[PDB]
Amino acid sequence: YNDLRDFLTLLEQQGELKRITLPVDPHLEITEIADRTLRAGGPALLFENPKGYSMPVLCNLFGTPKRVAMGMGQEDVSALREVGKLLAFLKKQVLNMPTKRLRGAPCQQKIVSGDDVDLNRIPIMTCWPEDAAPLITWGLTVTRGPHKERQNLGIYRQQLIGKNKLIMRWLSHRGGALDYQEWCAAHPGERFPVSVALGADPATILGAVTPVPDTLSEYAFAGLLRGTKTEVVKCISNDLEVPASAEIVLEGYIEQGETAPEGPYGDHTGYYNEVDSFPVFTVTHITQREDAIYHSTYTGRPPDEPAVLGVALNEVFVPILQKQFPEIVDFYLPPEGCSYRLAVVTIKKQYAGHAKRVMMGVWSFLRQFMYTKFVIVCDDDVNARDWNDVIWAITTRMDPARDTVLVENTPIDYLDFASPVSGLGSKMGLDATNKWPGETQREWGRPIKKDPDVVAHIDAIWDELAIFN
Amino acid sequence: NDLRDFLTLLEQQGELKRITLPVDPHLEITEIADRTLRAGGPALLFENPKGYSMPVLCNLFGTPKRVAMGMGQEDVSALREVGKLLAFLKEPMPTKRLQQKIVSGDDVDLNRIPIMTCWPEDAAPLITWGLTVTRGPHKERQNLGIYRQQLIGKNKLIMRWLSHRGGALDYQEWCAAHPGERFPVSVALGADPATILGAVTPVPDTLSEYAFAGLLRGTKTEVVKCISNDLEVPASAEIVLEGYIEQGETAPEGPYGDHTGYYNEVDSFPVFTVTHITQREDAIYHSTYTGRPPDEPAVLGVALNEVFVPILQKQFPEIVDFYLPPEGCSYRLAVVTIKKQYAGHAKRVMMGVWSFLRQFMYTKFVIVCDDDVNARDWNDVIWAITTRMDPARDTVLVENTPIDYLDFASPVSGLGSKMGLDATNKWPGETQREWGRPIKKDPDVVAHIDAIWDELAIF
Ligand SMILES: Cc1cc2c3c(c1C)C(C)(C)C[C@@H](S(=O)(=O)O)N3c1c([nH]c(=O)[nH]c1=O)N2C[C@H](O)[C@H](O)[C@H](O)COP(=O)(O)O
Numbered sequence A: 001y002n003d004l005r006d007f008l009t010l011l012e013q014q015g016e017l018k019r020i021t022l023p024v025d026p027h028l029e030i031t032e033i034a035d036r037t038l039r040a041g042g043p044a045l046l047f048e049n050p051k052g053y054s055m056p057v058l059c060n061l062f063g064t065p066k067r068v069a070m071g072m073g074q075e076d077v078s079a080l081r082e083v084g085k086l087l088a089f090l091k092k093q094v095l096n097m098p099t100k101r102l103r104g105a106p107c108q109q110k111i112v113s114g115d116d117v118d119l120n121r122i123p124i125m126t127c128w129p130e131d132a133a134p135l136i137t138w139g140l141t142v143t144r145g146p147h148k149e150r151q152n153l154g155i156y157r158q159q160l161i162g163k164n165k166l167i168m169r170w171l172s173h174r175g176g177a178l179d180y181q182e183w184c185a186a187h188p189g190e191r192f193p194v195s196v197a198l199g200a201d202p203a204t205i206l207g208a209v210t211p212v213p214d215t216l217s218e219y220a221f222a223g224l225l226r227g228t229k230t231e232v233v234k235c236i237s238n239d240l241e242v243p244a245s246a247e248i249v250l251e252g253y254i255e256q257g258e259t260a261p262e263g264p265y266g267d268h269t270g271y272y273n274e275v276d277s278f279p280v281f282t283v284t285h286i287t288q289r290e291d292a293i294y295h296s297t298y299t300g301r302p303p304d305e306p307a308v309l310g311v312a313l314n315e316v317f318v319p320i321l322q323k324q325f326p327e328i329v330d331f332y333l334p335p336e337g338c339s340y341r342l343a344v345v346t347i348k349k350q351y352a353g354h355a356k357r358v359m360m361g362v363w364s365f366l367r368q369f370m371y372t373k374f375v376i377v378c379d380d381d382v383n384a385r386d387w388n389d390v391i392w393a394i395t396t397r398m399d400p401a402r403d404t405v406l407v408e409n410t411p412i413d414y415l416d417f418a419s420p421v422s423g424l425g426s427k428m429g430l431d432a433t434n435k436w437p438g439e440t441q442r443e444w445g446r447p448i449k450k451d452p453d454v455v456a457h458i459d460a461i462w463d464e465l466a467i468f469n
Numbered sequence B: 001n002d003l004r005d006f007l008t009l010l011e012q013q014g015e016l017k018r019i020t021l022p023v024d025p026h027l028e029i030t031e032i033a034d035r036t037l038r039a040g041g042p043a044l045l046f047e048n049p050k051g052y053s054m055p056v057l058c059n060l061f062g063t064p065k066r067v068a069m070g071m072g073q074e075d076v077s078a079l080r081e082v083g084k085l086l087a088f089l090k091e092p093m094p095t096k097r098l099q100q101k102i103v104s105g106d107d108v109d110l111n112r113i114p115i116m117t118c119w120p121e122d123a124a125p126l127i128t129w130g131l132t133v134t135r136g137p138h139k140e141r142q143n144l145g146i147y148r149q150q151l152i153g154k155n156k157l158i159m160r161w162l163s164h165r166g167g168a169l170d171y172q173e174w175c176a177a178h179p180g181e182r183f184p185v186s187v188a189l190g191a192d193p194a195t196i197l198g199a200v201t202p203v204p205d206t207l208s209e210y211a212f213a214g215l216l217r218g219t220k221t222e223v224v225k226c227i228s229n230d231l232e233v234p235a236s237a238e239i240v241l242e243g244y245i246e247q248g249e250t251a252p253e254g255p256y257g258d259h260t261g262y263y264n265e266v267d268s269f270p271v272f273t274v275t276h277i278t279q280r281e282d283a284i285y286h287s288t289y290t291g292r293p294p295d296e297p298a299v300l301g302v303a304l305n306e307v308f309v310p311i312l313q314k315q316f317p318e319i320v321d322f323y324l325p326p327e328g329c330s331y332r333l334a335v336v337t338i339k340k341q342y343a344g345h346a347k348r349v350m351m352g353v354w355s356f357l358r359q360f361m362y363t364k365f366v367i368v369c370d371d372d373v374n375a376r377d378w379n380d381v382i383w384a385i386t387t388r389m390d391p392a393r394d395t396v397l398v399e400n401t402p403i404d405y406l407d408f409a410s411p412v413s414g415l416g417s418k419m420g421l422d423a424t425n426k427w428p429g430e431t432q433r434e435w436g437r438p439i440k441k442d443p444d445v446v447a448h449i450d451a452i453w454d455e456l457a458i459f
């Protein structure tokens, strides 16, 4: 049973984890370093010498698809396709696979409570210059509602506002938020217990961010990814269970009606979002391991680690698109398109006008892609994940006015300020497929194909040629 | 059980008329059937076709009722439950093989059968209710489809399957996997209604239309091995034609009047060579015609839309109703009513219609409305269009989309545009005006007048 440290050791063995011994500030500096590293496809980062703290800071954990896959015990990303197929069937009784509860766990080696609680001792990162305060970004928030037993895990950003106070920024459709809302109705004025785990094992982390239905515990999903039940421990001050191997656990509650102005904070869109009110999480206990490590990240102008995560987790929907449109070879939402705003789709085209049906399919078939503003459709000789192929296709297979489709007055994310009216805007599709007779009267270009015999011969003498050494 | 049992049921209920007067299969039957269909009349059995001894049955499914009866049910609204069944599709019933008596060889002569000529400029007599049975080389599934078949000789028919059909794909794959070998084919005329309906229902290519007929019937489809090949045809069929397609043999087909109300121009299709004809003793010939709608195929197509509504609703639960008027050539215009939940919703629904199911890929007009509209009444639909739309704001046009190659109205063969009319109530963001509150009646007044209606005695 691999905890997070076992994963960091695996990564280090494979040249996927760099230990930084230089002093680095959690205020802004770590983010800068992580950002350059992620943008160059570099390793995960463990800052052993954060300025002003003793607890090392881990970030960029999942900055690469490979490391996401490794985090689920795999070579590559396509086990997520199988999850997609699973989650489909429900709309398999031993997917009610529970947690395995230990009594006593490494995450409760050191315990501090009441007035000794001081979040300022933890190297919480400040990500961007106009961010309001340090921000906890990789907390697994654990909650129960009053009506079912299911424990939800979500990642909700948490602003520091005091020695023992965080703001809990769950958006209103989240498990945590719905649990709190129901607790309030069902028990007026009673405190809502909540717990937050930092640095759990990778399967739990990945399970938290898999979009499983509200009816199911994310702990059960982590179990399927791992191959074994998730190891947990009861919290000290409530009946919630947190992962046993967690590096740090925050326990506490939400006082009903206590709220605070949250932000502004830079988000995955690359802009600051404006101040808004969210509940206050009061921290009564902090439990941690000996030699605890603090797991953090940042969100900002993409790509960032959440966006790389989000790409790997989109594999969950590709098979559902392919059941419906088997012509679709690949379907990719670049991180640098804020994760959902641009799609590149490659097809085996079968008739004139095919690309238009596919665009309309993307914009209608699933709710996950209904708000996608740009859709580029290409043939299967294009790698959707390489802008060198996609731009090549766009610039050699399109006449812009002929091959661009615009639809006005369509549903758009209310937070997208670039549309003319909140909730309503246009969409564009680019048909960059080879044009067939009927679509063009010209003699279409024959692409240059290499001689496989020459390719193989050069493979054979490549090392001996010694061009590099 | 078989077709004859169905005819007897219909006759008992005043839904089948026997015509004893002499009537020519050249044009006359079509005229009689067309009038009958247009007035919602019964199915028709012509016992005295001029120049033949074999009775001619047509307008079998000329009414929605008779389509329902043909699947054992009492009502057209049972077809929704069939749709719920046709849904079962994610992941993680065979034939019963056993009659038809007499048989031919070199004295195969299709001219002895009362094949109909439907319209005055049609090229030749045409077989219109043949269940064509095929296997491909790669799977075992037997496809059943209805493909019009022109008479060109004592023993030769043209096989007009369009290129996306099961039969056509099977032949195309057979050619390629077995160059120059004959493609066995069989056509059954007058099978039991469930099999017939199963054949026209668009089930996925992966599934034998025999399996689906089994679900409609409640029991496995009874079938028999053909004499000259390994295909199986329904045991109760009135006539069976067996033979093959010689690779590369093609003939000019048509012109023929179509379900669009126009003549298709001449075009080339494979030749089906008939080596055997098998039939029952007092065989009945099942035929129909297509033309300007409504016709029997269009009535079929309306009943089979009820099957699709649930499949559309599973995917788009905002859809309350979904209707393809027969007058739109059955597939070219759709009216969809929704419970609108956000600004711009209609657009998602239009794109869904144009992308979700293949039968609607060529639908050139889509009108979307709110749920206070009855999609089946032009009075409501036009009222919605003319009171809830600004044409330029609320009309969506998409160019260069797939279109039926026979649709001569598109600017280029196979490619044309589509139009969606958003006739929903416009929400803030879509309009800055004060939207109209519709006039609702007082249900107390309505009920009070219902109560004194008879006493008022206006009629
Ligand atoms: C992986 C991740 C995810 C999330 C977040 C972040 C990360 C790293 C951080 C903390 C960096 C930043 C924000 S942000 O992406 O919204 O900019 N954060 C976040 C937030 N969901 C949310 O409601 N508030 C949040 O604050 N999300 C999404 C959320 O956790 C996710 O959608 C879960 O699947 C929700 O689980 P449920 O509540 O549906 O069970």
Ligand SMILES: Cc1cc2c3c(c1C)C(C)(C)C[C@@H](S(=O)(=O)O)N3c1c([nH]c(=O)[nH]c1=O)N2C[C@H](O)[C@H](O)[C@H](O)COP(=O)(O)O
Pocket: B127, B128, B129, B143, B144, B145, B146, B147, B148, B149, B160, B161, B162, B163, B164, B165, B166, B167, B199, B200, B201, B202, B203, B209, B257, B258, B259, B288, B289, B290, B297, B300
């Ligand atoms: C009920 C019916 C249907 C059909 C047809 C006819 C009838 C009575 C007739 C022979 C009267 C008229 C033509 S027509 O509507 O295209 O003019 N006919 C027909 C044709 N499908 C086809 O490819 N060629 C055809 O010739 N169709 C449609 C096709 O049979 C039907 O859509 C099947 O579900 C398709 O079979 P699969 O390939 O899906 O297995």
Ligand SMILES: [Mn+2]
Pocket: A152, A153, A154, A175, A212, A213, A214, A216, A218
């Ligand atoms: Mn959840």
Ligand SMILES: [Mn+2]
Pocket: B143, B144, B166, B203, B204, B205, B207, B209
């Ligand atoms: Mn079929």
Ligand code: NA
Pocket: A152, A153, A154, A155, A175, A207, A208, A209, A210, A211, A212, A218
């Ligand atoms: Na979750």
Ligand code: NA
Pocket: B144, B145, B146, B198, B199, B200, B201, B202, B203, B209
């Ligand atoms: Na069929």
